[PDB]
Amino acid sequence: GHMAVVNIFGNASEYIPPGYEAPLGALTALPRCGTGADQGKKVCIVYHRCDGVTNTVTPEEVINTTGEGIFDIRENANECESYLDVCCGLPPVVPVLKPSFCGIRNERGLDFKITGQTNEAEYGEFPWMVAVLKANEEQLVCGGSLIAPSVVLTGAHCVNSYQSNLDAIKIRAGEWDTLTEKERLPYQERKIRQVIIHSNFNPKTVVNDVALLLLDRPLVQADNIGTICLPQQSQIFDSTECFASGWGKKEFGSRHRYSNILKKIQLPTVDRDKCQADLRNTRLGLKFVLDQTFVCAGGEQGKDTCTGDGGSPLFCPDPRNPSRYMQMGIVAWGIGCGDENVPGVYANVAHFRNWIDQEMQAKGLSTTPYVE
Ligand SMILES: *[C@@H]1O[C@H](CO[C@@H]2O[C@@H](C)[C@@H](O)[C@@H](O)[C@@H]2O)[C@@H](O[C@@H]2O[C@H](CO)[C@@H](O)[C@H](O)[C@H]2NC(C)=O)[C@H](O[C@@H]2O[C@@H](C)[C@@H](O)[C@@H](O)[C@@H]2O)[C@H]1NC(C)=O
Numbered sequence: 001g002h003m004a005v006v007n008i009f010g011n012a013s014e015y016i017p018p019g020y021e022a023p024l025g026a027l028t029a030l031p032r033c034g035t036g037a038d039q040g041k042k043v044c045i046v047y048h049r050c051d052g053v054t055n056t057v058t059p060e061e062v063i064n065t066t067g068e069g070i071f072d073i074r075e076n077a078n079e080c081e082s083y084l085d086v087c088c089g090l091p092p093v094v095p096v097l098k099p100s101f102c103g104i105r106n107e108r109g110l111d112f113k114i115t116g117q118t119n120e121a122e123y124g125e126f127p128w129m130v131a132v133l134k135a136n137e138e139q140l141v142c143g144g145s146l147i148a149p150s151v152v153l154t155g156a157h158c159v160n161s162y163q164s165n166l167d168a169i170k171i172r173a174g175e176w177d178t179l180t181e182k183e184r185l186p187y188q189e190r191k192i193r194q195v196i197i198h199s200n201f202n203p204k205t206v207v208n209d210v211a212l213l214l215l216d217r218p219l220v221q222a223d224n225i226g227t228i229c230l231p232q233q234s235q236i237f238d239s240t241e242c243f244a245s246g247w248g249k250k251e252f253g254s255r256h257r258y259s260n261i262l263k264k265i266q267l268p269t270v271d272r273d274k275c276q277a278d279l280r281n282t283r284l285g286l287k288f289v290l291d292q293t294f295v296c297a298g299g300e301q302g303k304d305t306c307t308g309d310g311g312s313p314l315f316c317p318d319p320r321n322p323s324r325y326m327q328m329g330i331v332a333w334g335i336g337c338g339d340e341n342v343p344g345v346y347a348n349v350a351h352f353r354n355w356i357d358q359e360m361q362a363k364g365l366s367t368t369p370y371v372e
């Protein structure tokens with residue numbers, strides 16, 4: 001009954017400014033590198049502690065703005081074991097709150113552009129990708145999207161069973177490679193203060209599979225953190241450039257691989273009526289009716305594993321502003337991404353715009369972060 005006053009007086013609708021709120025240790029203790037005259041004389045150090053021009057270790061964190069960095073993510077492809085380490089030679093101003101814009105993709109990646117990749121997303125490519133994790137299949141419960149500094153959008157099926165046990169879960173934003181913390185901008189975690197599950201959600205037919213996660217405190221502003229824009233109520237998407245993105249429940253944080261970088265897959269929208277038709281052609285029969293709370297996108301030919309995690313966002317370009325992205329869907333089933341002949345079925349975000357606006361307003365939370 002007092003969530004409103006806290007959110008209003010606490011400015012829960014804005015990011016906490018940077019600076020407002022792990023020493024590498026002895027350089028000699030770092031793994032050696034270098035060949036020729038430098039053999040064994042240089043050190044393997046996280047890129048943000050090695051000057052890009054002088055190739056020399058730095059006393060403090062440094063930021064490369066040349067936009068010419070290219071990192072090969074493949075194991076054994078670099079001088080150093082870790083692709084985020086640079087073979088370096090032996091030897092900041094904290095900005096205020098900046099303006100924020102929803103749906104901004106970093107197509108070229110933050111800090112560096114990757115190479116040697118298959119379906120990996122650039123570092124910080126989609127700043128709104130959030131992971132819902134067990135605080136206590138494995139660590140990752142579901143995916144989700146940041147729609148406001150203190151609000152995450154996900155599927156009801158994801159948190160329905162944690163309503164009376166919110167302490168068992170948490171969210172992680174700004175994540176990229178779940179197997180290392182070498183990324184310059186770190187991930188951020190927050191406890192979930194409340195969960196708002198749509199009133200007409202039904203776990204059987206999976207209709208109205210949407211929920212809001214209200215965080216205990218807003219996220220800190222950073223380039224690897226950003227909201228996704230929401231569509232207008234009833235909006236219909238038409239694009240060949242949407243994306244699904246995820247880490248995989250089994251892979252997330254599983255220290256049995258070289259890396260677990262956020263993955264992405266480009267997919268086109270599929271008209272509602274056509275989709276129902278494709279579904280009717282399956283054993284579902286021509287009597288099957290696709291509920292209005294679902295939308296479709298194209299599937300993959302040779303199938304194996306779906307890219308978007310349950311509850312994660314299916315997003316497409318804003319037709320009125322092609323440079324930014326809007327959320328079209330929510331992954332209802334991690335295994336329901338379809339194939340070459342049968343489209344993937346997702347929760348229809350546009351059908352819930354008014355509902356989201358209303359829940360936000362009732363909590364004293366501004367909706368501008370997913371509009372501007
Ligand atoms: C809640 O936010 C208020 C407004 O913040 C300003 O506008 C935001 C959009 C953003 O740009 C932010 O950076 C701006 O500062 C704060 O009030 C402002 O506080 C600053 C100093 O912190 C002060 O210089 C401004 O005059 C003041 N603006 C006003 C009068 O609204 C709130 O800060 C608290 O309340 C203030 C009245 C002041 O007593 C301040 O010392 C308090 O920290 C923010 N509240 C909280 C809990 O942080």
Ligand SMILES: [Ca+2]
Binds near residue numbers: 177
């Ligand atoms: Ca990481």
